[PDB]
Nucleic acid binder design. Structure first.
Length: 476
RNA sequence: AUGGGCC
RNA sequence: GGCCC
């Protein structure tokens, strides 16, 4: 978005310097072009004269203003997508109780009891369990007073900026391109879940191309469902965004909230309000307070779903701005936040759509190589979704999510102290789709030191998971 | 060091 | 706890 004000204040909000990710035995074997992100300005791996604080906020390059004609069209697309969305999900979108917003429901996982509480609770040295009882699903006086302010629509807040401790490419580590996490206060997350938690639960349960959303999917079993759907189409596009979250313009965000979360769709009047507080935000980083107009904070309850919804409307927006008679059945798509797969039988020109996306402040590029443009004829077996390829399994004839060996090597090369064993079993579930040989090679540095699941046992687990009958068929 | 999903 | 976003 657009940084409108940068003010220095005496109260310093500390960020986590020093990585918690340490090199494993695999690191010296695979030697990955990957490492922990830079969290300190004094990190020796950084390029000379590169200030980490400057790069972190470089993504805020402005807040695109839309004309009345573009806003009217966006409203049409948002309303059209909202129509489709609420037709599938239903309109039982009444507020969640405090209990259900903490403990979750079918399709909605419980609130994390031990994560960061946000501001100003972090300045008071308070943990999440001091404000909210996560066992019995009740709140303290601090949160209850804040919920009352949210009812009255008078609630104000700041976002706590944390540097994301994660593995990134050595190029990005050297460029100081550390991603940031905008931690929202716990009561905001609770109230958002109260306002739109039913809806979010319904979206997770009804994931697929019909609503254009993969939020809630299990790639192990859903790759077959998605793969067979997208293979039915003549053209498939792997569309990349840059700073997707940051580049949501206030116009687009506001209109989407207005069209999707209407009271006629069964929402409480405050659902629209609480989401609109994400448009213009105040961010606290160290001694600095930064006001930003536009963009979506990462730490909101429904960041992925909001991002997914917008992504759907953007594609419908872009196409209708260029072509005539474009409807929801003109194409098919699945998204998960900024990650997107688009398909159609019409020879659509995505290179021509570039400026139309730019009118929303979004920059689209092909994921497929550098290429120097979007091309036609690509199938689902060419594209990447959720860092996973679409490969056919030799033994079953089902689509399976295959990750790049280079990526798996990177993931395996680092871990937090004493979590290597638990991480190994978790990553094994991802590595099983690379085949027996690559599976053996990936875990070769770990042999005799940890327990590595056999390829056979995870393959049979997957077969049953993707389709129960296919596992029984290999017995008949 | 987070939201959300899945394991 | 890990992964994806």
């Amino acid at each position: 978005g657009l940084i409108v004000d940068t003010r220095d204040v005496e109260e310093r909000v500390h960020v986590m310097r020093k990585t918690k990710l340490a090199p494993t035995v695999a690191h010296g074997v695979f030697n990955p072009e990957f490492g922990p992100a830079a969290l300190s300005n004094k990190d020796s791996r950084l390029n000379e004269g590169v200030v980490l604080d400057e790069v972190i906020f470089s993504k805020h390059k402005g807040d695109t203003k839309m004309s009345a004609e573009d806003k009217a069209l966006f409203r049409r697309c948002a309303a059209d997508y909202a129509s489709r969305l609420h037709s599938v999900l239903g309109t039982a979108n009444a507020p969640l109780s405090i209990y259900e917003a903490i403990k979750g429901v079918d399709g909605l996982d419980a609130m994390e009891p031990d994560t960061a509480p946000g501001l100003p609770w972090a300045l008071q040295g308070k943990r999440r369990g001091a404000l909210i009882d996560f066992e019995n699903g009740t709140v303290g006086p601090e949160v209850e007073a804040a919920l009352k302010l949210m009812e009255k629509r008078e609630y104000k807040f700041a976002c706590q900026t944390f540097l994301k401790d994660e593995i990134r490419s050595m190029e990005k580590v050297r460029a100081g391109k550390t991603r940031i996490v905008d931690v929202l206060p716990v009561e905001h997350i609770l109230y958002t879940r109260m306002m739109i938690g039913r809806f979010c639960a319904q979206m997770h349960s009804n994931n697929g191309p019909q609503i254009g959303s993969a939020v809630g999917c299990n790639p192990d079993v859903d790759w077959q469902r998605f793969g067979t759907h997208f293979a039915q189409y003549r053209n498939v596009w792997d569309v990349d965004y840059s700073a997707f979250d940051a580049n949501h313009c206030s116009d687009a965000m506001n209109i989407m909230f207005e069209e999707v979360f209407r009271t006629e769709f069964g929402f409480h009047p405050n659902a629209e309000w609480i989401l609109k507080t994400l448009v213009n935000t105040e961010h606290a980083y160290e001694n600095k307070r930064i006001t930003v107009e536009g963009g979506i904070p990462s730490g909101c309850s429904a960041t992925s779903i909001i991002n997914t919804i917008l992504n759907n409307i953007y594609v419908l927006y872009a196409l209708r701005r260029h072509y005539e008679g474009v409807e929801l059945d003109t194409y098919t798509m699945i998204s998960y936040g900024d990650d997107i797969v688009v398909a159609s039988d019409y020879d659509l020109d995505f290179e021509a759509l570039k400026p139309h996306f730019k009118s929303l402040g979004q920059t689209i590029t092909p994921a497929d190589k550098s290429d120097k443009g979007f091309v036609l004829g690509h199938s689902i077996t060419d594209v990447t979704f959720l860092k996973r390829h679409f490969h056919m399994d030799y033994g079953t004839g089902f689509y399976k999510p295959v990750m790049a060996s280079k990526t798996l090597e990177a993931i395996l090369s680092f871990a937090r102290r004493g979590t290597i064993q638990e991480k190994l079993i978790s990553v094994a579930g991802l590595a099983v789709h690379s085949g027996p040989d690559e599976y053996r090679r990936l875990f070769e540095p770990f042999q005799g030191l940890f327990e590595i699941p056999s390829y056979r046992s995870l393959y049979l687990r997957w077969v049953n998971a993707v389709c129960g009958d296919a596992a029984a068929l290999a017995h008949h």
